[PDB]
Amino acid sequence: DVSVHEEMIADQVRTEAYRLGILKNWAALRGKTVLDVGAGTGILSIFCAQAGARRVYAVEASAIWQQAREVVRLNGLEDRVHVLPGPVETVELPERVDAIVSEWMGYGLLHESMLSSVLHARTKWLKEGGLLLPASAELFVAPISDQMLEWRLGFWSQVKQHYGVDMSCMESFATRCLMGHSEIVVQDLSGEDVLARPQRFAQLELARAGLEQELEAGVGGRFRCSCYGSAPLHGFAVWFQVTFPPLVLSTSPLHPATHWKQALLYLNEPVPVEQDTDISGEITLLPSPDNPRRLRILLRYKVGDHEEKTKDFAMED
Amino acid sequence: DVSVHEEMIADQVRTEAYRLGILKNWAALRGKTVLDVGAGTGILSIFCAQAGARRVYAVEASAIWQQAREVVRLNGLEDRVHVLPGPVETVELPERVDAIVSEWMGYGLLHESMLSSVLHARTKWLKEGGLLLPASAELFVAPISDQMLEWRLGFWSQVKQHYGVDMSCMESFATRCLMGHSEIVVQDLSGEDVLARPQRFAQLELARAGLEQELEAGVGGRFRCSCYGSAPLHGFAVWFQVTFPPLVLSTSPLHPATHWKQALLYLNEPVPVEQDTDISGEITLLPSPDNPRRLRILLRYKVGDHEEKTKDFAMED
Numbered sequence: 001d002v003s004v005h006e007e008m009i010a011d012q013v014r015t016e017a018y019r020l021g022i023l024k025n026w027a028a029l030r031g032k033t034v035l036d037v038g039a040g041t042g043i044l045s046i047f048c049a050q051a052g053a054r055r056v057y058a059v060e061a062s063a064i065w066q067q068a069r070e071v072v073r074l075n076g077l078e079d080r081v082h083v084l085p086g087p088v089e090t091v092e093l094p095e096r097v098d099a100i101v102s103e104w105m106g107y108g109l110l111h112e113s114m115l116s117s118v119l120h121a122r123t124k125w126l127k128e129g130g131l132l133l134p135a136s137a138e139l140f141v142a143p144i145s146d147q148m149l150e151w152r153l154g155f156w157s158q159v160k161q162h163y164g165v166d167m168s169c170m171e172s173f174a175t176r177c178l179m180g181h182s183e184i185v186v187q188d189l190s191g192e193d194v195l196a197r198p199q200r201f202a203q204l205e206l207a208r209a210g211l212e213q214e215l216e217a218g219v220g221g222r223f224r225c226s227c228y229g230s231a232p233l234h235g236f237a238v239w240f241q242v243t244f245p246p247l248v249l250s251t252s253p254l255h256p257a258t259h260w261k262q263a264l265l266y267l268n269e270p271v272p273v274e275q276d277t278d279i280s281g282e283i284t285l286l287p288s289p290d291n292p293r294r295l296r297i298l299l300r301y302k303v304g305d306h307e308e309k310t311k312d313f314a315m316e317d
Numbered sequence: 318d319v320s321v322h323e324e325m326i327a328d329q330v331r332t333e334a335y336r337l338g339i340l341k342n343w344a345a346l347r348g349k350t351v352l353d354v355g356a357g358t359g360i361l362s363i364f365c366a367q368a369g370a371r372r373v374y375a376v377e378a379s380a381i382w383q384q385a386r387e388v389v390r391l392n393g394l395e396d397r398v399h400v401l402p403g404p405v406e407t408v409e410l411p412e413r414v415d416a417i418v419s420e421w422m423g424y425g426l427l428h429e430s431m432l433s434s435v436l437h438a439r440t441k442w443l444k445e446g447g448l449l450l451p452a453s454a455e456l457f458v459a460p461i462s463d464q465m466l467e468w469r470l471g472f473w474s475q476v477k478q479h480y481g482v483d484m485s486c487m488e489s490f491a492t493r494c495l496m497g498h499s500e501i502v503v504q505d506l507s508g509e510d511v512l513a514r515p516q517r518f519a520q521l522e523l524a525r526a527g528l529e530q531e532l533e534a535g536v537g538g539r540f541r542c543s544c545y546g547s548a549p550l551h552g553f554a555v556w557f558q559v560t561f562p563p564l565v566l567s568t569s570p571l572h573p574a575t576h577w578k579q580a581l582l583y584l585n586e587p588v589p590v591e592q593d594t595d596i597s598g599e600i601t602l603l604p605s606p607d608n609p610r611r612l613r614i615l616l617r618y619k620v621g622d623h624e625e626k627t628k629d630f631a632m633e634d
């Protein structure tokens with residue numbers, strides 16, 4: 001229960017990006033009012049007060065709201081930051097607000113579906129022309145050769161050289177277990193895993209008319225790239241960045257690691273690729289039919305001269 | 318599902334200890350018959366055949382028995398190693414056996430309670446004077462100051478120095494979450510965490526009359542030690558070793574790491590200790606009332622001049 005909060009506060013990229021994204025908007029926040037949607041243990045509301053906000057409403061649905069109230073008190077801000085328990089959809093604020101801040105991004109950007117609550121608060125509580133922090137988000141994909149996966153699968157074929165027993169038949173079993181499922185896998189990668197230049201496949205402007213309906217219909221787009229070299233293709237990694245009106249908070253595997261890691265879409269088995277193998281496809285992020293908070297990703301892809309294939313993923317538990 | 322098997326075969330201590338423990342008994346195994354209780358993917362049965370066993374019955378209750386049959390075939394041993402699906406309690410072997418091998422140890426030695434199946438097979442299938450591999454087990458305890466836990470709890474009090482927001486009130490919350498529960502926690506430690514000389518608190522001779530009834534009544538004993546230095550005491554670590562009639566397979570945090578890690582018994586909160594603080598107590602490993610395969614540990618302990626305390630733990634899921 002503390003574990004998610006520990007991961008957040010140990011994430012220097014996340015924490016410093018928000019701290020400085022908020023501080024860069026001092027001019028817009030000075031003497032103004034802020035709503036923190038899903039304030040958690042409260043650090044973003046405190047940052048907003050430290051950037052000069054007159055008053056901050058920290059709205060938190062979970063039990064941890066009590067810790068935000070204590071953090072506010074410890075920092076001497078109890079008369080300017082008000083912690084309000086419950087869903088933002090039904091909280092009663094005493095006034096409309098000049099800015100909304102929220103740490104709404106989930107794995108694969110949209111898992112848990114919190115953006116809809118930020119948009120609900122924007123409509124209900126944000127003053128005309130008010131500020132959203134962050135203001136926008138971009139989605140990226142790249143083909144991957146997951147070096148750790150390669151090693152895990154291949155180790156069965158190395159048992160003979162280490163213990164004198166051939167265990168290579170386990171490779172196919174392990175491949176079925178680790179790649180043959182249809183779950184999105186959250187795992188951190190690096191440049192050593194990235195097989196082609198990353199491609200931006202969608203852009204979300206949080207204030208833009210129609211975004212709520214786009215989320216319901218599916219967010220995404222097509223991509224195309226060409227492989228850097230020869231390797232087993234394991235699938236694709238999806239990640240995001242968000243922008244504070246600019247400072248960019250990135251979750252790319254080519255940038256410093258974050259608690260969001262990346263969302264991995266594994267093909268049913270490895271596919272050999274070579275330098276300049278063309279890969280194209282389409283990725284759509286959707287709410288799951290049974291749970292709208294569980295991310296679903298529909299992947300279409302075409303590797304080289306192979307036929308276009310499809311794989312329909314749901315977020316791992 | 319493959320994950321437990323990957324962890325096993327990547328555990329060089331486990332795999333080499335069994336390989337050499339088996340090979341050291343070549344004289345007793347040459348031309349003889351072996352039962353492998355819970356053969357899994359089969360490597361121990363193959364090792365026994367490579368030590369000269371005439372015939373090996375590899376008994377495996379789970380679905381993975383099919384992989385053991387394929388591993389046996391890949392190594393050309395299908396006419397000497399027979400993979401038999403189902404519980405050893407009801408398998409029909411064609412003959413009594415000269416030796417039993419088994420990888421029966423769980424976390425905290427007895428979690429999952431597989432030893433009882435080895436003892437059932439000994440009674441039912443082992444010839445008089447036959448060999449058990451391993452033959453014996455010892456249980457150890459030491460007081461611990463878990464350096465990673467210390468850092469995790471203390472990081473809340475460092476937030477002010479890194480981001481300018483006091484979050485020290487989260488320390489008590491985090492302590493309640495991470496130490497205030499009554500679950501056994503499986504985690505690997507090292508010498509940096511060990512606060513006093515480890516103490517052996519029980520010895521199990523697998524062939525000895527009465528062991529089945531001891532397991533039901535509880536295995537364990539008293540211990541006493543004196544702390545090396547000043548540190549927050551977080552509780553105790555429990556681990557085991559097993560002996561092949563001698564080669565010792567150790568899961569101590571002072572020895573190379575294994576997939577069994579150690580079983581950690583955290584006190585409800587840290588207790589300061591100093592050089593030469595005397596600690597005494599008693600540890601009993603028991604089957605859980607509701608699930609006999611789930612390990613329960615009853616801990617009595619006395620730190621310095623503090624009163625004796627009790628904590629009743631059950632294995633984490």
Ligand SMILES: COCn1cc(CN(CC[C@@H](N)C(=O)O)C[C@H]2O[C@@H](n3cnc4c(N)ncnc43)[C@H](O)[C@@H]2O)c(N)nc1=O
Nearest residue numbers: 038039040041042043060061062087088103105106112117
């Ligand atoms: C998104 O997926 C990752 N994710 C993120 C968080 C981060 N936290 C805290 C945010 C942060 N600013 C701090 O603690 O500093 C977001 C918090 O937002 C809360 N929340 C969600 N929808 C709400 C609503 N309609 N009204 C009010 N509160 C709502 C939710 O209960 C979390 O406590 C978490 N805890 N778990 C997660 O898996």
Ligand SMILES: COCn1cc(CN(CC[C@@H](N)C(=O)O)C[C@H]2O[C@@H](n3cnc4c(N)ncnc43)[C@H](O)[C@@H]2O)c(N)nc1=O
Nearest residue numbers: 355356357358359360377378379404405420422423429434
């Ligand atoms: C103990 O706690 C850790 N532990 C261990 C294993 C190791 N394996 C495989 C052993 C090994 N020699 C190989 O695969 O090389 C032990 C195997 O033993 C099987 N088993 C248990 N009781 C049985 C019975 N009465 N009759 C027949 N088979 C039985 C069980 O289904 C496992 O597959 C595992 N898989 N999970 C775990 O959590």
